[PDB]
Amino acid sequence: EIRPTIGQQMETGDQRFGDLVFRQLAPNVWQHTSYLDMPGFGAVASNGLIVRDGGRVLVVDTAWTDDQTAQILNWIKQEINLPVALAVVTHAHQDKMGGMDALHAAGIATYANALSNQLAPQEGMVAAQHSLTFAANGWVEPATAPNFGPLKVFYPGPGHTSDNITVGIDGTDIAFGGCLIKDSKAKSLGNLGDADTEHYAASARAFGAAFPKASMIVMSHSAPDSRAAITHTARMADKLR
Numbered sequence: 444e445i446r447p448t449i450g451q452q453m454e455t456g457d458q459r460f461g462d463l464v465f466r467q468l469a470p471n472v473w474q475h476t477s478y479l480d481m482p483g484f485g486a487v488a489s490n491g492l493i494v495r496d497g498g499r500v501l502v503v504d505t506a507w508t509d510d511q512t513a514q515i516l517n518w519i520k521q522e523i524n525l526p527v528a529l530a531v532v533t534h535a536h537q538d539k540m541g542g543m544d545a546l547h548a549a550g551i552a553t554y555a556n557a558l559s560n561q562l563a564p565q566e567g568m569v570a571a572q573h574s575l576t577f578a579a580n581g582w583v584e585p586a587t588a589p590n591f592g593p594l595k596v597f598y599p600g601p602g603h604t605s606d607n608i609t610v611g612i613d614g615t616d617i618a619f620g621g622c623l624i625k626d627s628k629a630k631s632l633g634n635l636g637d638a639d640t641e642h643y644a645a646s647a648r649a650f651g652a653a654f655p656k657a658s659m660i661v662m663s664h665s666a667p668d669s670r671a672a673i674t675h676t677a678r679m680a681d682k683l684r
């Protein structure tokens with residue numbers, strides 16, 4: 444164990460490395476998984492991504508902690524041995540931004556929604572060093588996301604949080620919903636403490652429409668799923684209104 448209370452369990456094709464688990468999803472895409480031990484409840488998994496783009500690596504989301512995020516960088520060093528060009532973090536919660544200091548100490552440029560950077564200090568965390576802004580239809584303003592390569596950043600609207608962003612991986616059929624999207628077998632939308640219950644369903648559907656040909660949907664707290672994760676999330680969110 445490797446037996447989280449919440450989050451996917453270990454399957455064939457998963458690599459344990461330190462306290463983390465890594466799963467290759469495509470030739471150039473890996474999922475990183477880290478765990479927070481909650482007393483009396485057990486381990487909660489959080490997932491992000493590692494993408495190789497030629498001679499560099501791009502990261503989506505930190506681990507829960509600085510030490511776990513340093514372990515991600517160690518895995519990258521050992522298994523890929525290419526430099527990390529940048530990281531984009533997908534909202535101001537600990538599962539996504541808890542390891543900012545480790546990225547900064549390593550000299551990695553960090554990007555987040557401007558709103559995430561504005562909210563991070565109120566959540567006790569460190570803002571990314573660069574702010575992404577978005578058009579009225581949710582697409583990132585390209586001048587704020589320079590040299591992002593295959594990462595296609597989309598703000599779907601308020602849902603899990605007001606600042607949640609999503610990332611498509613161009614040249615693949617993978618899109619990352621972060622904590623907005625829950626899997627097709629989920630019984631709940633997870634933590635709604637900071638959620639916009641009015642707009643959640645439309646935001647989930649907007650993510651689906653932004654990446655209409657993505658067949659593998661990666662998410663923070665479950666194994667990758669089909670597009671039924673999007674439709675199931677939206678249907679659960681419909682019930683909040």
Ligand SMILES: Nc1nc(C(=O)O)c(CCc2ccccc2)s1
Pocket residue numbers: 449487536537538603622625629630631632633634635663664
């Ligand atoms: N940091 C944490 N984020 C979340 C989240 O929802 O983003 C937590 C809830 C985990 C969960 C998810 C789905 C079903 C049941 C539980 S905890």
Ligand SMILES: [Zn+2]
Pocket residue numbers: 534536603604622
């Ligand atoms: Zn969150």
Ligand SMILES: [Zn+2]
Pocket residue numbers: 536538622663664
């Ligand atoms: Zn979360």
